Design a protein around this ligand. Structure first.
Ligand SMILES: *[C@@H]1O[C@H](CO)[C@@H](O[C@@H]2O[C@H](CO)[C@@H](O[C@@H]3O[C@H](CO[C@H]4O[C@H](CO)[C@@H](O)[C@H](O[C@H]5O[C@H](CO)[C@@H](O)[C@H](O)[C@@H]5O)[C@@H]4O)[C@@H](O)[C@H](O[C@H]4O[C@H](CO)[C@@H](O)[C@H](O)[C@@H]4O[C@H]4O[C@H](CO)[C@@H](O)[C@H](O)[C@@H]4O)[C@@H]3O)[C@H](O)[C@H]2NC(C)=O)[C@H](O)[C@H]1NC(C)=O
Ligand SMILES: *[C@@H]1O[C@H](CO)[C@@H](O[C@@H]2O[C@H](CO)[C@@H](O[C@@H]3O[C@H](CO[C@H]4O[C@H](CO[C@H]5O[C@H](CO)[C@@H](O)[C@H](O)[C@@H]5O)[C@@H](O)[C@H](O)[C@@H]4O)[C@@H](O)[C@H](O[C@H]4O[C@H](CO)[C@@H](O)[C@H](O)[C@@H]4O[C@H]4O[C@H](CO)[C@@H](O)[C@H](O)[C@@H]4O)[C@@H]3O)[C@H](O)[C@H]2NC(C)=O)[C@H](O)[C@H]1NC(C)=O
Ligand SMILES: *[C@@H]1O[C@H](CO)[C@@H](O[C@@H]2O[C@H](CO)[C@@H](O[C@@H]3O[C@H](CO[C@H]4O[C@H](CO)[C@@H](O)[C@H](O)[C@@H]4O)[C@@H](O)[C@H](O[C@H]4O[C@H](CO)[C@@H](O)[C@H](O)[C@@H]4O)[C@@H]3O)[C@H](O)[C@H]2NC(C)=O)[C@H](O)[C@H]1NC(C)=O
Ligand SMILES: *[C@@H]1O[C@H](CO)[C@@H](O[C@@H]2O[C@H](CO)[C@@H](O[C@@H]3O[C@H](CO[C@H]4O[C@H](CO)[C@@H](O)[C@H](O)[C@@H]4O)[C@@H](O)[C@H](O)[C@@H]3O)[C@H](O)[C@H]2NC(C)=O)[C@H](O)[C@H]1NC(C)=O
Ligand SMILES: *[C@@H]1O[C@H](CO)[C@@H](O[C@@H]2O[C@H](CO)[C@@H](O[C@@H]3O[C@H](CO[C@H]4O[C@H](CO)[C@@H](O)[C@H](O)[C@@H]4O)[C@@H](O)[C@H](O)[C@@H]3O)[C@H](O)[C@H]2NC(C)=O)[C@H](O)[C@H]1NC(C)=O
Ligand SMILES: *[C@@H]1O[C@H](CO)[C@@H](O[C@@H]2O[C@H](CO)[C@@H](O[C@@H]3O[C@H](CO[C@H]4O[C@H](CO)[C@@H](O)[C@H](O)[C@@H]4O)[C@@H](O)[C@H](O)[C@@H]3O)[C@H](O)[C@H]2NC(C)=O)[C@H](O)[C@H]1NC(C)=O
Ligand SMILES: *[C@@H]1O[C@H](CO)[C@@H](O[C@@H]2O[C@H](CO)[C@@H](O[C@@H]3O[C@H](CO[C@H]4O[C@H](CO)[C@@H](O)[C@H](O)[C@@H]4O)[C@@H](O)[C@H](O)[C@@H]3O)[C@H](O)[C@H]2NC(C)=O)[C@H](O)[C@H]1NC(C)=O
Ligand SMILES: *[C@@H]1O[C@H](CO[C@@H]2O[C@@H](C)[C@@H](O)[C@@H](O)[C@@H]2O)[C@@H](O[C@@H]2O[C@H](CO)[C@@H](O[C@@H]3O[C@H](CO)[C@@H](O)[C@H](O)[C@@H]3O)[C@H](O)[C@H]2NC(C)=O)[C@H](O)[C@H]1NC(C)=O
Ligand SMILES: *[C@@H]1O[C@H](CO)[C@@H](O[C@@H]2O[C@H](CO)[C@@H](O[C@@H]3O[C@H](CO)[C@@H](O)[C@H](O)[C@@H]3O)[C@H](O)[C@H]2NC(C)=O)[C@H](O)[C@H]1NC(C)=O
Ligand SMILES: *[C@@H]1O[C@H](CO)[C@@H](O[C@@H]2O[C@H](CO)[C@@H](O[C@@H]3O[C@H](CO)[C@@H](O)[C@H](O)[C@@H]3O)[C@H](O)[C@H]2NC(C)=O)[C@H](O)[C@H]1NC(C)=O
Ligand SMILES: *[C@@H]1O[C@H](CO)[C@@H](O[C@@H]2O[C@H](CO)[C@@H](O)[C@H](O)[C@H]2NC(C)=O)[C@H](O)[C@H]1NC(C)=O
Ligand SMILES: *[C@@H]1O[C@H](CO)[C@@H](O[C@@H]2O[C@H](CO)[C@@H](O)[C@H](O)[C@H]2NC(C)=O)[C@H](O)[C@H]1NC(C)=O
Ligand SMILES: *[C@@H]1O[C@H](CO)[C@@H](O)[C@H](O)[C@H]1NC(C)=O
Ligand SMILES: *[C@@H]1O[C@H](CO)[C@@H](O)[C@H](O)[C@H]1NC(C)=O
Lengths: 184, 441, 49, 49, 196
């Protein structure tokens, strides 16, 4: 992580060297006016500017940072205040950093969910597949458009309570227009 | 101004008009059920990791806090809702193949039938791939001028090449998250829904012919007394010609000559709407990114330039206009997003009613799920949402028939029809009784 | 309410003056005798004055 | 704790929180410009009272 | 349900999916209390942004400049603050129209389900609706839909009417009913429940 001053552009980041050649001008900006790359004039090689500290998506379960949905690798988030076995996994789209060994955990109680990846209590990411059901129906009350065959009619029953919330009001606010733009 | 079946028939004892013949008409609708969620870092965006900036965000940590919580607690309500609606039954998923709908030629071509030519466009050939209609659809989103979805972020932190457009957005603290439901689960979800019509018996892998499925769904409108083979033909040919005019409107390939119907007008409502849906997500962000070059009445549009000209006692005043200028640029983005989350939450609420009452159940609310009396409905995937195919009834002929609504014999005993929808009438010297929905004497 | 601030609360070295004994000393900012090597920014002179 | 100080709460609900790190203090400098033949001047401002 | 709410009940350990119904609510109620104290405190705190002017208070401006030239300075306060209201107003009318959809939804759920046992499948819960109980909540209701769930089934051969001696036809009046033999005895049941 350096501090650069490249052709008048300025900022901090990590500069690397690559093997790719573009026949163009000196440097290459983003849509936000940040440096992405630049060309040395005395030779042909171009370099790549990457900012030093990318963001992370650390996951906390009960006053403890469990792991980080990160992008690079070895970002710290675990190390020290004074003065470990910090594993690093590889998902299809991102890295993942948590001190749990891919061995014999086999129990965790609470999960924090996302689209296909839920993180459970001992750092273990489970792949969230689609919930499999028997038949995509609740075979009573619906249309029963089958006759004269070997049909299946339900015998026993049980209930299941499912709660929902509906918001019906908002606390109204009466704003004086003249008082606000100038207090009298 | 009526579709005279399924509605109330509040006329008796007159010269009433009861429909005889019928035909179907397919009308498609689109419903958008998800939006690609975006996780925005508040602190990275207003200053890209500058150390002197973050000692000035401490004055505004109230404003920075709400912006993150407005986005997460809108996004988390999606994934909790979407993961509890989309269910795939693997038993019925193995019936969605078009080869299943052809391989049962015992007697007739059972698992297809006369409706096989229209259903060949909707069902996938093998277990798990998009069908013919979505293949026409997804050739109108890349040719719309867009398209990339497999955004790896491991390539973003490598420095092998000059940065991609997507990786450049990540550097400013804007994460385009993956879609909460991908294209593959939507392909699995809709294909599981159509399999519920071919599957009725759980513990027997034999399947019901689709001609039995429609013949059953006619009975819930009115109890069919006599059924003929000719009635199966006119329903099926009008069904298959409906899908072909649908297919010709989509990707300009079918087998016809020239036809100007009104199924285009159902289709043009969809294709305009799908064209807009892909054209939001790439445009709110690129407007938000491009507001990192507006020096809001300051020296330069980059922060590290400011701290290398001025001293800290006076550079803070210059960078203050960057902070309050950029913090307003987030609230312009956040309020536009929460518009869409609440708007989708109405449409996703609409999709649960249409999936449950119409795709699974043949609802009897007139006008809902199409236009007229609902027979069935088939779904397909689409860019961020479903694409319905409501099949409604349509009458063609009628019967001028004099009616009564009960018998009085010898002016002593009265008799009234138990069902009110029924009505009594003579029919070539013979008195019959029929519902006023269909001519089923 | 709550607020964030950069406050001086990093107590390097606490020196309890007894009330009775001798209410007079010197305090050096940089490397005093009552604290071995370290150098601080403020002296928070806490009291019931 | 940096998440907690950014959240203004002593206890967090479990979930996903965008965190990062304060970067460093001392960084080696880097200055690249178009190459040119050196012509360097030394002007000083001098005040005598 | 009670164990998910305030972490007090009488059980041992149970991981069901009623939490997943409950977690949809407790996230939503947590957001609803967290709007009203935050749009205003953002709007109040825009009375310290001197929009390219001398100071963020008006009476300071009129005690430095004369009226022929102080009006130009206070003009940027007015047009700056008037835009700060429209940023607040449009955010509010977003919520009034959004609630008006949800309040429209609450009239359907109260009338068709709390009072009436609606028969629209899937509406008011997940499956066939039995009843529903309500409770208060911060700014809105909290429903408790009680749906039916089947567990067992009956593999049964069926018919849908009788033809006797190839002369007379007989069809079931209800279409939902179906006829079937049952240990040598012919019965008739709906195809919803096994009620022979
Ligand atoms: C809305 O309404 C619908 C309808 O009422 C409700 O839908 C019902 O939901 C329930 C619960 O989700 C379904 O019951 C079953 O769910 C099982 C999964 O839960 C777990 O238990 C199983 C063991 O039974 C574990 O294996 C699972 O563990 C998981 O993780 C491992 C990894 O370690 C994976 O490998 C597994 O695959 C799991 O992901 C969970 O702990 C599910 O397994 C069960 O499966 C049935 O179908 C599969 C299909 O292959 C069969 O193989 C399996 O044998 C079951 O088939 C039937 O036969 C057995 C006889 O042994 C019966 O006992 C079963 O009841 C079943 O009939 C099944 O899916 C239920 O099926 C579903 N539908 C109905 C009609 O009840 C929804 O809950 C309600 N809410 C929502 C939001 O939809
Ligand atoms: C210059 O002048 C100033 C001004 O006088 C001097 O500052 C004063 O210093 C006083 C202490 O020296 C302080 O007096 C009290 O401090 C108490 C805390 O310590 C008490 O408790 C411990 C042991 O507690 C254990 O048991 C108790 C119950 O018995 C439990 O509650 C605890 O959790 C422990 O389990 C004892 O060892 C001490 O002897 C004390 O009892 C406060 O508790 C106490 O009053 C509290 O209750 C009052 C109502 O009766 C309330 O008005 C007051 O605000 C306190 O409430 C506070 O604490 C409770 C604890 O639960 C908390 O819930 C409340 O929210 C709140 O935090 C006294 O505060 C003086 O307050 C302090 N200033 C005042 C007003 O005089 C200063 O010393 C002096 N400098 C010099 C000369 O050096
Ligand atoms: C979009 O939708 C339109 C509207 O339906 C479709 O156009 C129809 O296309 C079909 C197929 O070509 C037409 O059906 C055929 O009609 C023929 C007779 O038409 C003449 O005679 C009738 C009266 O009898 C007149 O009304 C009409 O104007 C013509 O003068 C028949 O010969 C065909 O039947 C023969 O072949 C079929 C097998 O293909 C056998 O089943 C029969 O036994 C028989 O030998 C046939 O049904 C239909 O007329 C067209 N409709 C209109 C309004 O023109 C488009 O095809 C559709 N686009 C698609 C699917 O892409
Ligand atoms: C719908 O349900 C019906 C009721 O279950 C089904 O009829 C059953 O079909 C199965 C087919 O596997 C038959 O089971 C077979 O039985 C034969 C032997 O049957 C012969 O011998 C026995 C005595 O051993 C005698 O009782 C019979 O009358 C026959 O003479 C075995 O060789 C097979 O391995 C197999 O077990 C049932 O016997 C049959 N039951 C009846 C009452 O007919 C029907 O097939 C189903 N239709 C479907 C699924 O489409
Ligand atoms: C409801 O429907 C009923 C059935 O159609 C209607 O009754 C019909 O009403 C029309 C009125 O235009 C009659 O048609 C007229 O017929 C007379 C001649 O009828 C007399 O002579 C013929 C033999 O030629 C004989 O069959 C009759 O019994 C009469 O003695 C013509 O002069 C008129 O131009 C006209 O054509 C029908 O005859 C009549 N049918 C029956 C079975 O009564 C009824 O009017 C309708 N009610 C309404 C619309 O309110
Ligand atoms: C997450 O859920 C996904 C969807 O359910 C899972 O994908 C499924 O993975 C299973 C594994 O059993 C596949 O089952 C397959 O069985 C076939 C046999 O089919 C072959 O023959 C048929 C015709 O008879 C032909 O059409 C097929 O193409 C095959 O030739 C095996 O060949 C397969 O390899 C596999 O065993 C499901 O089909 C597959 N579903 C889909 C739609 O892809 C996924 O595995 C799950 N991931 C988990 C649980 O971690
Ligand atoms: C830019 O120009 C400045 C003005 O000349 C440069 O400052 C000069 O730096 C050189 C470094 O060698 C000094 O030379 C040294 O002088 C000291 C003693 O300094 C005192 O005595 C000298 C006697 O000549 C007197 O001129 C000074 O003012 C002091 O009174 C010796 O001990 C060293 O061995 C060596 O001779 C110059 O003295 C100094 N000049 C002044 C006026 O400061 C400066 O280095 C230039 N900066 C660059 C090139 O980056
Ligand atoms: C639906 O299925 C039919 C017939 O079903 C097929 O054959 C049965 C015997 C079973 O084995 C089924 O499992 C199998 O799918 C398919 O019909 C095919 O139709 C075409 C004409 O449309 C026939 O092709 C012709 O073959 C003759 C020589 O016999 C040539 O002169 C022609 O050049 C032409 O190729 C084809 O033979 C016939 N296929 C079979 C298996 O007989 C139909 O294609 C299918 N529809 C689909 C998959 O969409
Ligand atoms: C206030 O009282 C304190 C003591 O409470 C005084 O400080 C002490 O002063 C005495 C001398 O009067 C010191 O004793 C000598 O210290 C030197 C250190 O090198 C040692 O070599 C001698 O042999 C002797 O021990 C004492 O160390 C010092 N510190 C203490 C004891 O706290 C302070 O001077 C008084 N302030 C006044 C009177 O203004
Ligand atoms: C504050 O820290 C400094 C170091 O940064 C301390 O200075 C150190 O003092 C010790 C003790 O005198 C020195 O150790 C000595 O080493 C010699 C041999 O070289 C040995 O003969 C002595 O017996 C003793 O062990 C140490 O070298 C020295 N370090 C430096 C770099 O100066 C200072 O004492 C500390 N002050 C306190 C105690 O607060
Ligand atoms: C990603 O993580 C791995 C584990 O920390 C790092 O692994 C090696 O680091 C050494 C440092 O010199 C390299 O020489 C090896 O080539 C790395 N192996 C690989 C490919 O992982 C690795 O540093 C991190 N990422 C990279 C590309 O350095
Ligand atoms: C209206 O329905 C009737 C009865 O189904 C149809 O009448 C039949 O038409 C076919 C020609 O397609 C004839 O071969 C039959 O003999 C007719 N049957 C009777 C009893 O008349 C009639 O075609 C239908 N109308 C339309 C426009 O399709
Ligand atoms: C997980 O389960 C194992 C055995 O089932 C138990 O020993 C362990 O303590 C559990 N983990 C917890 C409670 O965190
Ligand atoms: C069928 O009925 C006969 C006589 O009613 C009885 O003996 C037999 O047990 C029944 N079969 C059952 C209950 O499976």
């Amino acid at each position: 992580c350096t501090d650069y001053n490249i052709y008048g552009f300025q900022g901090t980041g990590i500069i690397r060297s690559t093997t790719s050649r573009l026949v163009a001008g000196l440097y290459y900006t983003s849509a936000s006016g940040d440096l992405l790359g630049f060309k040395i004039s005395t030779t042909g090689e171009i370099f790549t500017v990457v900012p030093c500290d990318l963001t992370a998506q650390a996951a906390v379960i009960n006053d403890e940072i469990v792991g980080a949905i990160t992008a690079t690798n070895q970002t710290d988030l675990f190390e020290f205040v004074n003065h470990s076995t910090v594993n690093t996994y590889t998902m299809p789209q991102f890295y993942y950093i948590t001190k749990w060994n891919n061995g014999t955990s086999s129990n965790c109680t609470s999960v924090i969910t996302y689209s296909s990846f839920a993180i459970c209590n001992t750092g273990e990411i489970k792949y969230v597949n689609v919930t499999h059901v028997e038949i995509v129906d609740d075979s009573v009350g619906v249309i029963k458009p089958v006759s004269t065959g070997n049909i299946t009619i339900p015998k026993n029953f049980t209930v299941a309570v499912q709660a929902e919330y509906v918001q019906i009001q908002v606390k109204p606010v009466a704003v004086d227009c003249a008082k606000y733009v100038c207090n009298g | 101004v009526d579709d005279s079946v399924g509605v109330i028939k509040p006329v008796s004892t007159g010269n009433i008009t009861i429909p005889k013949n019928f035909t179907v008409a397919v009308q498609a609708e689109y419903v958008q059920i998800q939006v690609k969620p975006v996780a925005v870092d508040c602190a990275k965006y207003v200053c890209n990791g500058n150390r002197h900036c973050l000692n000035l965000l401490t004055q505004y940590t109230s404003a920075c806090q709400t912006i993150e919580n407005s986005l997460n607690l809108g996004a988390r309500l999606e994934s909790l809702m979407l993961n509890d609606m989309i269910t795939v039954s693997d038993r019925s998923l193995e019936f969605a193949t078009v080869d299943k709908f052809n391989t049962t030629a015992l007697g007739g071509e059972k698992l297809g039938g006369l409706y096989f030519d229209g259903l060949s466009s909707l069902l996938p050939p093998r277990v798990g791939m998009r069908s013919a209609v979505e293949d026409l659809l997804f050739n109108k989103v890349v040719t719309s001028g867009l398209g990339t979805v497999d955004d790896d972020y491991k390539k973003c932190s490598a420095g092998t090449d000059v940065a991609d457009l997507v990786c450049a957005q990540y550097y400013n603290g804007i994460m385009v998250l993956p879609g909460v439901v991908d294209y593959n689960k939507m392909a699995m979800y809709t294909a599981s829904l159509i399999g519920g019509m071919a599957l009725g018996s759980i513990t027997s892998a034999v399947a019901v012919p689709f001609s039995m499925q429609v013949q059953a769904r006619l009975n819930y409108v009115a109890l069919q007394t006599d059924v003929l083979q000719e009635n199966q033909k006119i329903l099926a040919n009008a069904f298959n010609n409906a899908i072909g005019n649908i297919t010709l409107a989509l990707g300009k390939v079918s087998n016809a000559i020239t036809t100007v119907s009104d199924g285009f007008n159902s289709m043009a409502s969809a294709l305009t709407k799908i064209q807009s849906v892909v054209n939001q997500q790439g445009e709110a962000l690129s407007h938000l990114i491009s507001q990192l070059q507006k020096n809001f009445q300051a020296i330069s549009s980059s922060i590290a330039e400011i701290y290398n000209r001025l001293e800290k006692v006076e550079a803070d005043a210059q960078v203050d206009r960057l902070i309050t200028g950029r913090l307003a640029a987030l609230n312009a983005y956040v309020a536009q997003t929460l518009t869409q989350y609440a708007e989708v939450k109405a449409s996703r609420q609409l999709a649960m009613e249409k999936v449950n009452e119409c795709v699974k159940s043949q609802s009897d609310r007139y006008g809902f799920c199409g236009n007229g009396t609902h027979l069935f409905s088939l779904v397909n995937s689409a860019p961020d949402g479903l694409l319905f195919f409501h099949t409604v009834l349509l009458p063609t002929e009628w019967e001028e028939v004099t009616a009564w609504s009960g018998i009085c014999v010898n002016d002593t005993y009265a008799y009234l029809l138990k069902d009110f929808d029924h009505s009594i009438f003579s029919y070539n010297g013979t008195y019959m009784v029929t519902p006023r929905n269909m001519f089923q004497p | 309410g709550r607020v964030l601030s950069s406050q001086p609360v990093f107590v390097q070295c606490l020196r309890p003056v007894p009330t009775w004994s001798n209410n007079t000393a010197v305090v050096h900012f940089k490397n005093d005798v009552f604290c071995p090597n370290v150098t601080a920014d403020v002296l928070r002179f806490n009291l019931n004055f | 704790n940096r998440i907690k100080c950014q959240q203004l709460k002593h206890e967090l609900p479990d979930g996903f929180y965008s965190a990062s790190m304060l970067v460093k203090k001392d960084l080696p400098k880097t200055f690249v410009t178009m190459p040119q033949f050196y012509n360097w001047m030394n002007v000083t401002l001098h005040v005598v009272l």
